[model samples]
Structure formats: C-alpha cells, structure tokens
Target chain A: TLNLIDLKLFHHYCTEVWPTITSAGISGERIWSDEIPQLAFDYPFLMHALLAFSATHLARKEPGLEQYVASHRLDALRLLRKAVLEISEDNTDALVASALILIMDSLANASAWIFHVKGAATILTAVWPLTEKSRFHNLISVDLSDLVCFDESIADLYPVEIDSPYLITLAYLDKLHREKNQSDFILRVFAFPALLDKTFLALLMTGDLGAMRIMRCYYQLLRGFATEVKDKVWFLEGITQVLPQDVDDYSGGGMHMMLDFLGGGL
Target chain B: LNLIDLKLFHHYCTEVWPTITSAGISGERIWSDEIPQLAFDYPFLMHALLAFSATHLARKEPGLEQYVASHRLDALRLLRKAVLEISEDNTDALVASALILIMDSLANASPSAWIFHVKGAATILTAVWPLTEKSRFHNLISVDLSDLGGTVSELVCFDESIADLYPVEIDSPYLITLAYLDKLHREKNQSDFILRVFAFPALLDKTFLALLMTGDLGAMRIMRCYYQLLRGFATEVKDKVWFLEGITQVLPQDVDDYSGGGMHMMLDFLGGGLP
Candidate 1:
C-alpha cells in the first residue's frame, strides 16, 4: 500500500547472503586474524518491521526512502547469523556434527591458503579423528624346503606365475622388496641374479627421465612398453625390447633404480 | 571399448514418433484426419514425381535428401492445379479457391468481425488502387474528423452525448445494435433519445423506419409508441423493477409478438447499409 519498491528491495538483500554474513561476522574494522565467527539470525522479519517503521516517520520529514532501506538490510544480515547457529546446534548428531566441522575446517583451510592465516592446518588436524577404517592378510601356504636353490635359474629370479585365487605372487614379492630395507630384501631375493639384459635398459632410461613431468606420463610409458612386448610376442618370442634398451643407455639409470627395487639385476 | 549392448539399444531408433507406426485409420477414421495436409515435398513427393514423369526422374529411388529439398511452392501449386484439373476438371479451382472466396465474403459482410482469415482484407484493399484511396480518406479525414472535431458539428447531431466517438466502429451492424440495445436495457429515459436519434434522422428527412421497415407509416408510428412504452417503463422501474412488467400489462399480445420475432426482422432491415 505504501513505499512498496523500497520494502521489496530491502527484503531481497536480507534473504540471500544473510546466512553467510551471520557465519562470517562481516561488519567492523576487525583484523583478519581476530575476526569473531558467529551465526546470523532466526529470521529477517524484525529487520523488515524496523525499516517499514522508519519509512513512515521519515516520509513526513525528509520524504526519501533510501535511508530506511539501507538500515533494513544491515539489521537483517545481523539477525540472519544468529538463526543459522541456533539451527546447527539443535540438529547435532554424530554424522551431522562431524560433517559440519569438516565443512568448516575445509573452508578455514582454503581461506588460510589465500590470506596466509596461521593455525588453519592445526584446526583441520584436530578434526581428522572422525574418519573411517580397513585391513589385509595372506591365506596361501607354501613349502620353502627340499629344493636346492640355483644361482642362475630363471625360476629362482622371476618367481612362478599362479592363476588360481587370482592373486599374483610375483607382484607380492615385488611389493615386499620395495617396502623393506634395501639390504634385507635384496640379499634374500636377488643377491646373485641378472634378470634384465642391457638393450631394454637404454629405452627405459629416456622414458623414465621424460616421465617425471607428470605421473600420467610415467604410467603411459610403463603401459606402452608392456603393450609393445605383448604385440611382438609372435615374432620375438618372449623377448621384451624395453628391458635391454634401458641397460644400454646412461639415461636409463632411474628405471634401473626402480627395477633394482623390484630385485632386478641384483 | 565400452558396453556394446546398452549403446546398441540406445541407437535402435533414430527419430521418435508418437507410436511405432501410423495408427492406420482406426475408429472414426482418425488417422486420415490426423495426418498433416501436404504442401510441396512430403508424402506428395513420390506421388508428385510419378504423376509428372515428363518433368524429371532419377535412376535410384529418391530419398528425402535427393528429393527436391527447396521446391518452388508457387510452381508446385500451379503444377498441383494442373494435375487436379487433369483428373477432376471443374472441381479443381473450386477446391483450391474455396479459402479466398470465403474470406472475401466474410470481409465484405462483417468488416468489423475479428475473423483470422479476414485479416488480409485491409492489406489487400491497401494493395489495390481505388479501394486504398477510399480507405485512406475514411481513416485519415472522415474518422479522425468525427473523433477529434466538435462532435455535434462533425456528426450533424443535436445532442452532445450522442456525438461521443466510439473507439472502434468498422462495418459491424450487429455490434452497433447490440451496444445500443444494451444501453437501452439500462437507461429507460435514454431509450427515447436513442429512438429519436435513430428513427428521426434529419438528413434522411423521413424517419429511418419510413425508409426501411416492411409495413406503412402506421407501423412506424406503432414502433415509436412501443419505444415510448419501454422508455416510460425504464423511468418508472429504475433498477427497482423490470422494464417489461408495465409493457405486458398494457399490450400483452403486441408485447408477445414483439418479444417473439418482430425485433429480429426490423433490426435486419434498418441495421444494414443505407440502400
């Protein structure tokens, strides 16, 4: 019925970022490090009433509506913050509380990264206890006795491939060698064998150096070499070019380091 | 690289229709009526090409892409007419030209009626030479003068209220009568004024009924008396009672005759053009 244009515009601003202003404490000249974190209001109704009151009074004196509109929005934001906090506290459950903390922690971390705010990482570390868990075990039984171990045998160096239960023993041994101290796993597994020939070593060296540009590049090089060997198996029999090429070139040193961890050419 | 089964199923149909096939003429012959009217290149393409073999043909069966994509619609109409004439002689023009005739007759009779087809009349009138000149004169001078100029002097009427210009008045005799009839239905005193204005047109010298109605001057006199009866009744009733209550008391038989059919006949004669 009266100054409708001013009332509607003030109401729109109150609704949108009222929640953010409540949570962030957007007013005043407080330093970034000392700003208080709080929630806005339960609603903007009180603020709307205040503006409408001021509008009627001012209409007789100044005859302008903008001043009333500006005050209305500020009061709305102030109230909106109080409301969000009240709701969040009331709805507390294990999942909701943890998710809310995690959300705030992530936001704090992001804000710290941008503004160089200290203690953000410490805040995130405090909330990390609310995450979930898992474990692993081997079920296979094997006989290690009654066989004379040969120094140069391919079986001794490469390990047998198993199809049943769909788990690779070779891959397990390779993983074991990677995680253990160099001297312990090295002496037990490949102390006396030369697994890779030199020509494949040279090709492996150039690719390894180029691969450090991205992890995807390293993945592609390893994948492509395996594919090339598989494709050429009809003509070249069991020979893979990548292994010998790496040994021939000095550029292949990093790949040799990787292969040594796999117990190659020990 | 991916699931072949799901992709094959998705690719099975190209463009979707409401159904798998045309529901070929079901109950009430619905499919035949539901099918769109063919213009240039549709189901008509094959029929059109086969019918006019002298025009052109291709070795392979023409698909949508190979069929005349951009056809001469005028040429197509002319060819369609020629083919129709070849088959059904006199009926071709009658069927093809029915739309134009209907539109022209409606435009002439109910010039103010908002029929969708009659929209092109004003355009067609403006396109032609003589009618365009008359239309311009009527709109720019006659209508504007009657609307803006002093109403009594321009309309050649004595009453100031009678001289008020209406917003829209283009050749609608039914609407004019309806407007006045509705007004008379409201103001009974205004009824005599209406009757006097329409009945006793000064330029015509004779009353409108004298020139138009079926019977003699006596019939005209009777009609005036009937009008006076309505006006008096309206003045007396004035929202408190029905205007027809007094008329039925005085002239029951004449009121019955007037209410039953006479008004329609009289309206038809007087509401038409001056001739």
Candidate 2:
C-alpha cells in the first residue's frame, strides 16, 4: 500500500473509535475490541472494515483521513461480498460484523448508504438462520432489530395527491391489505406490477406522474402492514411454497404458468 | 512462509508473482521485478505487494492470517489515501497499488471486492492514463482501452433491438449503458466482440455500477438486455463467455418479471453456457 499504511491510524482505531461503536455493554466491547480484531486476522476483509471504520471516524476530526476511509471501505465491502458469495458457518459472524461496521462507514461518509442497507438486508436474509447459532447472535439481534425498526420509520408515509387512475392501484392495496394472508401475498409485488391493466401499465411504462403517484401509494400501502413482509420476504424457501401455490392450475406442456400476470403481457 | 524471516518477499519473487502476470506480455517484467524493487523506495507499494503475496499464501496455508492482514492494513492505511492524490512521482506506485488490490480481492474470491477493486484500477487509470501512461500496468491498461469504446458498427444498435423499442420506462443512464451494449450486440458476430463485452465494465458510471450491483429494477431491466445477448449467443456459439462465472448468478426473480424464467434459465441454460 502507500507507506500510507501508517501506524498512527491503526492506533487511532483501537484507542479512540472502538469504544464509540460498541453499545451492548461489556460483551459488545469485548467482541468489537477483542474477539473481532482477532477474527479480522483470519478474515483480513474484516480488518479492512476495522481500518475503514477507524479511518472514517478519524476523517471527522482530522479531515485528512478521508482517503483511508474509502480504501478500507472498499476493502471491507468487497471482502464481505466475496465471503457472502458463499455462505458458511465458520465465517458468518465475521461477515455480519464487517457489514455492521461498513454500514456505519456509509452513515459516517454520508454516501450511497441505501444500497449498502439493501446489500446488508440481502446478506442477513441468507444468513438469518445462521444468526441464531452465531457467536455474535445476541449482539447482532439487538443491533439488527434496531436497524429494522429504522426502516419502519422510513417506510412511514402520508397519502399522495394524484389522479383517479391511481385510485385503481390504491384500490388493489386496499384489497391486498384486507387479505387474511397479507403477510404472504405481499411477496407478489412483482406480479402486482405485471398484472397492471394495459392502461395503468401504459401510464407506468411511460413514466408519467399519475402512475408514479400510484406507485408511491403502493409503496406506502405495502409499508403499512409489511412488518411480516419485512421479516419473511427474503426466503428462497418461500418460492418452494409459492411455486406450489401459484401452480394450483397447471397449463399444458412441461411448463408451469402464471395466468394472471400473463394476461397483461405481450 | 514468514515475513519475520523475509520469506514472504522471497515467495512472491519466486512463486507468486508469476501468477500475477503471464509468461509473455507487456509490462510482465514490471510487476515481477520493477515493482518489487520500487517497493524498497515506496512503502505503500511494498506493503501492497507483501499484502497480496500473503493473501495468496493464506489461500493454501490458511495459517498466515495475521501476516496477510498486517501488510494489508499497512497498505490500506497509506495506499488508500495515497491513491486520491495522484501526481507525477506517485502515479506509478498508486496505479500499482490499485492493480495489486484488484488481484488481492480476486485471490480471495470476493466478487464485490473484485467489482469495486476493478473500478478502483479503472478509475485511477482512466483519469491518470495520460499522467501514468508509462506506469507498470501500461501494457495491460493499453490492451483494455485500445478497444475502450471499440469500433462501433452502424448496425450495432439494430442488432440488439426489442422489435421496435417500445413504451418502456427509461432515461439518461440506462440509455447510455443500453447503447453501449447494443453496440456489443451488433458487433456480436465479430471475433473481437467478446473482448469488448469483457472490457466494457470499466467504462460504467459509479452510480450505474451501484444500481447494477444492488440489482435495482431499472438496472436489472437494462442488464436483462445485456444478458439477453449472452443467452441468445449461447444458443449457437460454442466458445468462452468471459466474466459470466464470476457473475455469481443470473438476475433476480422480481427483476425477471420484467425478464424471463427464473432458475431453469440459470441451472439449465446459463450453466451449460458457462466458460
């Protein structure tokens, strides 16, 4: 690297920044400060995350460590992604810890965070089952629960003003909300989109405001009761159940069909 | 085996460095010899070099954990910051740092790291290609950008058309990228088109890469257009499809509502088409 690998920044991470990132009492500090640093030894990506986190923090007061921030962050993210590409029991804890720090790194840097949040969400989905057995399970659940609630607030919304055509989509939301299995059916947001009548689909496909206004309403509607959706929507396991549900009526040939969405397609 | 005994440096010189570059190509000597010697003069370069070498070692050894992180930590502390301020004296080392981090990411099989690190090298080289035109990666960089935009065939746009290009929702960035892929589609018949497909990633905008990386609907919709080319070409062509295996998997199911059949297209179709 550039002798840019200065000893001072590593010290800066250990002494000053480590304490601020920890929140779950002694265990939190012990893991963040003690265990994770060792884990990072095996998983250099996590070490990069540590360096990235510290560099980001120092950048605030020093204003000069900004470059360190980007470098360590990219290092952490790539390593996390690499580890994430293949999920394993051995490295799952380090992957989650690395993600949390990198998430904080985005918050501190104030750039491209939503994608990282989305990225982390996708990650947790794969490893959610792993979390219960994870070494950091207690720490992660508490921290992760806090992160999920943050989204609930962000998803909170007020009614938007739009044309009556949007009411068509909003009507579907009303219908969707009333369903007994709103928990389950919200997974079909993809189909909900494709099932749009030609008129609504035309307006949406064109980027005209009324359809977008309608899409905004749909977003909030999904948000309103989507706590279940948030918790359960990530499963590839869901498809096993959903495929059978949607395939209740099998069309001819070796193909399984979705008649409802196909009704609207070209 | 041990940096404490300087064997870490010795392993790279004799064993690992050859893996970085091939037997014969431009700048092959630069990476193996020049960069190692340069490292003595430049600490960032030295740490990055040692960091990557140790990274390869850890793959098989799996015990040199601290050795790898130590050099990597030392490298990132300086190299990360060093890259931002590229100049005449530092350009070579910085480019070398970017190039090494790329292999470092890949040697570990980290896709996001590969994507991000690839961007790092591309961004620095693209910006300072004029300044660092003489740097160690010159031959490599030159090979890539030599077809940076490549020869844009007139029919390139028509080659990848959706019948008549109907009432879809798209604007500037998607249009720009789609246009690039269209040229690839048109030139698909040419022998060099595959090289163009592989080289095109470096030219993508950061936001474009971000959305594409995250699998945003807008981005996936666009990539459906590109992968559409891959699957279509797979129907007839019997050759390598560069950059596909490293892609992890095909597009998502939701993304495919605007796209195709989900897993079958993957396991049966794309898998058979694999490099």
Q: Highest TM-score, which number?
A: 2
How many clashes in each structure? 34, 12
Candidate 2 lDDT by residue in tens digits, A1-266 = 23324334544555566676542122456666666766765777777877777776676667767787777677666767778878788888887777666655554432145455445444554565544666655443321121012322312222524554554465554465445243224223422443455677566655665555455444444444333333332211123321222233334311213222222221
Displacement of residue B101 (Cα, Å) in model 1 is 43
The C-alpha local distance difference test score for the whole of candidate 1 amounts to: 0.27
Q: Quote model 2's TM-score for chain B.
A: 0.56
Q: Residue by residue across B68-119, what tens digits does model 2's lDDT show?
A: 7787667766766776676777887776776676556544542234444544
Off-target runs (Cα >4 Å) in candidate 2 are A1-266, B1-5, B23-25, B110-132, B139-200, B205-275
Single out the weakest 10-residue window by summed lDDT for candidate 1 chain A. Answer: A134-143
Look at candidate 1 and tell me the lDDT of residue B229.
Answer: 44
Name the TM-score of candidate 1.
0.15
